[PDB]
Design a protein around this ligand. Structure first.
Ligand code: U0M
Ligand code: U0M
Lengths: 304, 304
């Protein structure tokens, strides 16, 4: 029993973190096989960051200008290229700790673990969601750039996020491991405003199911609703619209609890309209939206 | 910027988890040097658990009855002893992944990371606090017993917790790595009620400082208070009394923010008396008490 915001065990990713230095900029890189992946703004001065021409800046850089340190041992850079917003540094040594891995581009609402790192050294691990406005709400200080987000399936790490920047509002933006930003963000120190941070409805419902499984049931009511009726309420409260795809994904939690998805929607609708009246659900005073249905199944079933 | 409930990177502990089986009971063990540590109730049938005589049950067990598997390789048990509520299985092989480590018995209010494990396999990592009633609010299913709680100081893992049981109220109880329960709990399937789960005041204040550092400042008010006056309010709200030791520990956060500790106490007092009025602090609708002052400094400064 009990339900916690849980990160994947980070060991497989810890074994992949290195320090990258170019001139006087140090950040984190990800060493997989004989490639180190890092944010391309490693090549920028904070002056460069105001309006960088990355192709022009990169002309001035040779392999030997990229200092890559794995623990306290230097890696030899034998090649470098830019792919979108990441640099790929080819090194002469395959990372011996390379896990089975994939690169995935996640959808908004998907959760992942972040291994926050500084100078190639892991500091902590926490669980994030890709927000519907393609930001994440992380914990990143200066030097954390190149820290990565990941999911683990048994022994395979799916890397989905590399940290690139903080918006002036203190939310975070980054790329997949092909260097494509999530959302409309660019790796430039300029005005970039996030859109509406809507609530991930299907995740809230998953978490309500998790609550029922764990004995928090006070919010269950006598009502049901329809997708269309629920969606009018969702719109009013800046919740994402619920689709039949979302209902389908919640089917196993519906089956396990015997609470129809549309009944749980009606419970959520009343919570939106009435608030929590100073009560809590799984130790939260607000409706948690950073657990996916898959997360809830995993934690509630004990997958390793 | 940003402030997250952050666990220590778990790799060093992942390398220590093994499966222990005795008869038909399987749970987790901790392999450090040539000793595997696990809950002594590994020797019990669920029938035994109602009123176990562990010394009498252990007489019937030989080294070869303890099956210890590290990944998919069996360890040879060459000795076994009971220390309090843990078994120590001497194996013929030192764990090659043994980190620098210590065993510490933590105080109520102290935070630590849990590596939830099943069959010796890590499933997830999350951040816990030892509650003032010596319970923790974890996420533990059947098979998670022997999962451990830890802090990391640079390269040294301080193990503080091993998971033993769930109370009928679905909160968790366990031992230090000398096998002494936190609190009055016993490893028996009997009525065991937790005492008052009071709020860890010094942790709430730390988290309020974290909020100010991260730009959440709406709750700062024009007032101050005294320890005695604050403590009358704390008592009323089932908060732990604040001592000058707690004020001393908050000194660096006071210094960094320029907010006197007693001023932040007066802010907390108003939040207790007035509630949040539907507002949030660091994305929470309730006052978070599972960050220590040391945690807040660490996360806000970026220690690795
Ligand atoms: C060199 C650097 N100087 N500042 C940095 C942080 N941010 C600034 C905004 C945009 C990013 F992509 C990187 S990197
Ligand atoms: C064999 C076991 N059968 N049930 C177990 C879980 N709990 C029950 C309560 C008290 C504990 F120490 C262990 S262990």
């Amino acid at each position: 029993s009990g339900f916690r915001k849980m990160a994947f065990p980070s060991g497989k990713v810890e074994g992949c973190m290195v320090q990258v230095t170019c001139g006087t900029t140090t950040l984190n890189g990800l060493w997989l096989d004989d490639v180190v992946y890092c944010p391309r703004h490693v090549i920028c001065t904070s002056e460069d960051m105001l309006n960088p021409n990355y192709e022009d800046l990169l002309i001035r850089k040779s392999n030997h200008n990229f200092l890559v340190q794995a623990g306290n041992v230097q890696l030899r850079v034998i090649g470098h290229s830019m792919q979108n917003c990441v640099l790929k540094l080819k090194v002469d040594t395959a990372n011996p700790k390379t896990p089975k891995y994939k690169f995935v581009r996640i959808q908004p609402g998907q959760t992942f673990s972040v291994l926050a790192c500084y100078n190639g050294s892991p500091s902590g691990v926490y669980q994030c969601a890709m927000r519907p406005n393609f930001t994440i709400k992380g914990s990143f200080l200066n030097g954390s750039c190149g820290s990565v987000g990941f999911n683990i399936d048994y022994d395979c790490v799916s890397f989905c996020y590399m940290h690139h920047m903080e918006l002036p509002t203190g939310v975070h933006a980054g790329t997949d491991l092909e260097g494509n930003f999530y959302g409309p963000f660019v790796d430039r120190q300029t005005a970039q405003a996030a859109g509406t941070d809507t609530t991930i409805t299907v995740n809230v419902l998953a978490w309500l199911y998790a609550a029922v499984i764990n004995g928090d049931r006070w919010f269950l009511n006598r009502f049901t609703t329809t997708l269309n009726d629920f969606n009018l309420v969702a719109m009013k409260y800046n919740y994402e619209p619920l689709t039949q795809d979302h209902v389908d994904i919640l089917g196993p939690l519906s089956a396990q609890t015997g609470i129809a998805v549309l009944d749980m929607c009606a419970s959520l609708k009343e919570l939106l309209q009435n608030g929590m009246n100073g009560r809590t659900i799984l130790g939260s005073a607000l409706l948690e939206d950073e657990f996916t249905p898959f997360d809830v199944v995993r934690q509630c079933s004990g997958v390793t």
